[PDB]
Amino acid sequence: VQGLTEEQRMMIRELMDAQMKTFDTTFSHFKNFRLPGVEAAKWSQVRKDLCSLKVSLQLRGEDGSVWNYKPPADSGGKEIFSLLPHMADMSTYMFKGIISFAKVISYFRDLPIEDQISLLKGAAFELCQLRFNTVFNAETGTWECGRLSYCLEDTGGFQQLLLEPMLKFHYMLKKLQLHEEEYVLMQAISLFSPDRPGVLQHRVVDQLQEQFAITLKSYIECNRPQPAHRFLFLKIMAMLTELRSINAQHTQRLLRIQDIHPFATPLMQELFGITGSL
């Protein structure tokens, strides 16, 4: 609010507006989702890949009842896929919110439709993880999604869990104690990345991204004088670069698992380049 130009203030306001309209932070409208039921070299890697998703799951009913699901151990069989349909439904729900976020923003609406599609295919996973970070509780290792909770299982210990790049990302980013405004500028910087596959208006997207980055740098300078926030802008940009690498690693996991055991919803297939033809 302090020290920004009028264009920078309008930019933050437009992003905060889009975030408010399209982020169901209580997950009140996530419903009707599936739940876990009550050569060989490709299989060996798929087994390791699925370790990237292993969480337990709690559901608190409006009546006060609690269901809890603890996932199995890997015993060399199909039981390792039990959480995939639920995870697909959750990600699909998040992805719809992300697509709505982008479409409310003026700078995005003004790009040609092909570049909108390419930008969303490139960034949807990243914006999803940024939104999930805001409901991550780093004290209990839990993503608190309203009536749903997804909890990390104690291995090993805390430091042995933070070796997994996705978890180190979530814990390190939560430690920065970002404002809502800083999360939503992070989303814009990731969304308007000019080097995503298939982008045509590289120069326009690059100039938009740079403007979002300058606004973030200035927001931090004007509102965060404390020695703990020295280099905060550069810390955030380093997190964004690391998030891009996690996106490539986790996208290849999805594709290997999909090859052995189909689970991607139609929206996930569209976002991740699955044509529907073998």
116 carries a ligand binding annotation: no
For ligand Y7Q, the binding residue among 101, 107, 125, 183 (CB under 6 A) is: 125
Q: After which residues is the chain broken (C to N over 2.5 A)?
A: 38, 155
**How is residue 145 written in tokens?**
């999604």
Q: Is 254 in the site for ligand Y7Q (CB under 6 A)?
A: yes
**Span from 31-39, 67-75, 106-114, 164-172 in contact with ligand Y7Q (CB under 6 A):** 164-172
Q: Which helix (H) or strand (E) holds 143?
A: strand 142-145
Q: Is 268 in the site for ligand Y7Q (CB under 6 A)?
A: yes
Q: Is 168 in the site for ligand Y7Q (CB under 6 A)?
A: no
What whole-number distance in Å separates Cα of residue 143 and Cα of residue 131? 11
Give ∠ CA 1-237-23 in degrees, rounded to 5. Answer: 60
Q: Is 187 in the site for ligand Y7Q (CB under 6 A)?
A: no
Q: Is 128 in the site for ligand Y7Q (CB under 6 A)?
A: yes
What whole-number distance in Å separates Cα of residue 46 and Cα of residue 81? 10
For ligand Y7Q, the binding residue among 12, 119, 189, 257 (CB under 6 A) is: 257
Q: Is 123 in the site for ligand Y7Q (CB under 6 A)?
A: no
Q: Is 253 in the site for ligand Y7Q (CB under 6 A)?
A: yes
Question: Read out DSSP for 227-260?
Answer: GGGTTHHHHHHHHHHHHHHHHHHHHHHHHHHHHH
For ligand Y7Q, the binding residue among 23, 93, 101, 150 (CB under 6 A) is: 150
**Span from 53-61, 103-111, 198-206, 216-224 in contact with ligand Y7Q (CB under 6 A):** 53-61
Q: Which of 30/233 has CB closer to ligand Y7Q? A: 30
129 carries a ligand binding annotation: yes
**How is residue 93 written in tokens?**
């729900």
